[PDB]
Every structure is written in C-alpha cells, then in structure tokens.
Amino acid sequence: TVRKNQATLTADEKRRFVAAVLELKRSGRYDEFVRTHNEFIMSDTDSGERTGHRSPSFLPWHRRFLLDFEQALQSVDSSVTLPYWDWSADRTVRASLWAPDFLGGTGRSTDGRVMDGPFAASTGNWPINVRVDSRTYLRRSLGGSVAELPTRAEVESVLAISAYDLPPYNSASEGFRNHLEGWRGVNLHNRVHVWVGGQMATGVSPNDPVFWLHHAYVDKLWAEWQRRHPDSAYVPTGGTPDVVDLNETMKPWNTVRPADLLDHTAYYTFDAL
Amino acid sequence: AAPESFDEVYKGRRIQGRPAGYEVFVDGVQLHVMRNADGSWISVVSHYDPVPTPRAAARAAVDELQGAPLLP
Numbered sequence: 131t132v133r134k135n136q137a138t139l140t141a142d143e144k145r146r147f148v149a150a151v152l153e154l155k156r157s158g159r160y161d162e163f164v165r166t167h168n169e170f171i172m173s174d175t176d177s178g179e180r181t182g183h184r185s186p187s188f189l190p191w192h193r194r195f196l197l198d199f200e201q202a203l204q205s206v207d208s209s210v211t212l213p214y215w216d217w218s219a220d221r222t223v224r225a226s227l228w229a230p231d232f233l234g235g236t237g238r239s240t241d242g243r244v245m246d247g248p249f250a251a252s253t254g255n256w257p258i259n260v261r262v263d264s265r266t267y268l269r270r271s272l273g274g275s276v277a278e279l280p281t282r283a284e285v286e287s288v289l290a291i292s293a294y295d296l297p298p299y300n301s302a303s304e305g306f307r308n309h310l311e312g313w314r315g316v317n318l319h320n321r322v323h324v325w326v327g328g329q330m331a332t333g334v335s336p337n338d339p340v341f342w343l344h345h346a347y348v349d350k351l352w353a354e355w356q357r358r359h360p361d362s363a364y365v366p367t368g369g370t371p372d373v374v375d376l377n378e379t380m381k382p383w384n385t386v387r388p389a390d391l392l393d394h395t396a397y398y399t400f401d402a403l
Numbered sequence: 404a405a406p407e408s409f410d411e412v413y414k415g416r417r418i419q420g421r422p423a424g425y426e427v428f429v430d431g432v433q434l435h436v437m438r439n440a441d442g443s444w445i446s447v448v449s450h451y452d453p454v455p456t457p458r459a460a461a462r463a464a465v466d467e468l469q470g471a472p473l474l475p
C-alpha cells in the first residue's frame with residue numbers, strides 16, 4: 131500500500147511489476163483499461179459534460195482509474211504497487227526508468243518503434259490492440275515533440291496556487307487543477323504526454339506502461355498541494371451543470387464521488403510526501 | 404461560428420474538414436477532433452498538444468501517422 135518513486139525500486143520490484151503488467155496484457159484485462167480512457171478522452175468537452183479531463187474531476191477520476199489498475203495488478207501479484215515518475219527530477223532519456231530492465235527506451239527515428247525493454251514489439255508480449263494509428267507496436271519519441279520536461283521550479287509555481295479550480299471549470303480555467311493538467315501556464319501534465327510521444331501523446335495513452343507512472347506522480351502532486359493548502363478544497367461544491375460536484379457520483383463507476391477520493395491514505399501512501 | 408471546410412493533399416494523404424460540430428477525415432477515414440474553450444483544436448492522435456485550427460490538427464495527425472492508415 132505504498133507507492134514508491136520508480137527510481138528507488140529494486141531489481142526485484144521492477145521484475146515483479148513488469149511481470150504483473152505483462153500478465154494483465156496476456157489475459158486480455160489490460161486492453162480494457164486503454165479503451166475506457168480513450169472513451170472518456172473523446173467525450174470530455176469544454177462545452178458539455180466533462181468527467182475525466184479538462185474539469186475539476188480530472189484528478190479524482192484518474193485517482194480512481196489508477197486504483198482500479200493497481201487492484202488488478204495486485205490480483206496477479208499482491209506485492210506489486212504502482213510506482214511514480216518524478217519527471218521534474220528524472221528528466222533525461224538516460225533515467226533508469228528508460229533502461230531495458232524496466233520500461234525500455236525511446237523509439238528509432240524511422241517509425242518511432244521502441245526496440246528494447248520488456249514492451250518492445252519484438253518480444254511478442256506487448257501487442258498494441260486498442261488503437262487509432264493502425265500500427266501495432268509500441269512507439270516513443272522521448273523529447274522529440276517538445277524540448278524539455280517540467281522543472282521543480284515550475285512544479286513549485288503550480289503547487290503555490292491556492293484555488294483548487296475556478297469557473298468555468300474547463301481548459302480555460304485558472305487555478306491549480308488546470309495548471310497541473312497543463313491547458314494553461316507553464317504546462318505540467320499535458321507537456322509530459324507530448325514529451326514521451328508515441329501512443330503516450332494520443333487518447334490511447336495507457337498503451338504505454340509509463341502512463342501509469344506519469345499519472346501516479348500527477349496524483350502525488352495533488353497530495354502535495356493539499357498539504358500546502360490545508361485551508362483549500364475541491365470545487366465546485368454544488369449544482370454545477372456538466373461538471374462533477376464534490377458529492378456527485380463519477381462515471382464510469384457511479385459508486386464513487388470526488389469526496390470519497392480526496393484523502394488518498396484510505397487506499398495507499400507514498401514513500402515520502 | 405464553426406470553422407470553414409477544407410480539402411487538400413498533405414504529405415501524400417487527402418485531408419478534409421467540414422462543419423457538422425466539426426468532422427475531419429484522413430483518406431476517407433474519420434479522425435476524432437475536438438475544440439478547446441480558447442479556440443484551439445486537438446485530435447485523438449495528438450490529444451495533449453493544442454493547435455490553432457482543424458486543418459492544423461489534421462496535418463498533425465498525418466504527421467503522427469507517418470504513412471499509416473487511420474483506423475475507425
């Protein structure tokens with residue numbers, strides 16, 4: 131029940147995590163996670179109903195989404211937990227995260243095909259099934275579409291924002307949530323998806339295992355923000371059309387509200403907050 | 404006010420756009436696109452990188468695809 135920095139994992143933890151992920155893929159359970167995220171990424175609009183992205187519920191939604199995935203991983207190997215990627219610290223293509231014994235590196239120039247690691251197409255263990263871009267191999271272009279990943283200083287400026295979110299509660303919004311998501315400002319979360327490239331830059335981003343480590347860190351940043359602003363909390367808090375209010379139930383589950391996911395300690399803790 | 408329609412061949416692929424709120428096609432296959440509050444656009448194959456217009460989003464998709472056929 132402790133999410134650790136991917137950089138701190140032992141060779142054993144890394145082995146077990148990879149094996150559990152590959153088994154969810156083999157059993158066909160993994161692909162359904164990819165499908166769910168794309169469905170929400172395609173229907174979440176600034177003009178209408180938005181639940182998973184560009185709205186205040188972007189955080190509790192991905193929090194529950196990651197909880198589901200982690201629970202699925204634990205059904206395979208109860209010792210595995212979702213590690214996180216601090217892209218502000220481990221910002222180079224040579225981070226241990228991108229080594230052949232963990233996630234593998236960047237793609238080759240010609241077609242962006244990842245050639246090493248346990249998820250390279252050549253292993254026959256990571257078929258890209260849920261997709262839009264017809265190709266079926268994992269693709270990446272680390273730092274190809276955007277020069278740099280966010281820095282600690284930049285993350286600090288976003289964490290400083292006291293307002294959780296602000297009307298019109300969408301991609302035009304000011305406030306912590308939209309700045310963390312990245313639609314406005316120095317851009318944190320969105321820029322990271324772009325930096326990795328490949329499937330990570332698309333709606334079927336969960337096709338890349340790094341998607342989970344990336345969102346595990348975004349999730350931690352929300353935890354760090356709550357620590358900085360104990361006086362601040364989730365908004366809106368009542369009758370706001372097309373937006374999930376604090377005590378409103380969230381799709382696709384419907385049995386959970388942002389109010390139930392505010393405190394992460396009910397499900398897990400971090401190596402350090 | 405929806406954007407104007409367009410039809411051109413970009414990097415060997417035929418891209419078209421038309422108001423519906425707006426549809427885009429790459430070689431006949433529809434590409435999901437979305438408009439942001441500030442007026443910029445994004446497509447399913449470039450969903451975290453806002454571009455100014457629907458044609459910019461279609462050209463971004465052709466760029467991403469690297470020749471590969473789009474799947475419905």
Ligand SMILES: [O-][O-]
Pocket residue numbers: 183335
């Ligand atoms: O947000 O993926």
Ligand SMILES: [Cu+2]
Pocket residue numbers: 167171182183192
């Ligand atoms: Cu997402």
Ligand SMILES: [Cu+2]
Pocket residue numbers: 172173435
């Ligand atoms: Cu749509």
Ligand SMILES: [Cu+2]
Pocket residue numbers: 304309314315316
């Ligand atoms: Cu700002």
Ligand SMILES: [Cu+2]
Pocket residue numbers: 319323345
């Ligand atoms: Cu994301």
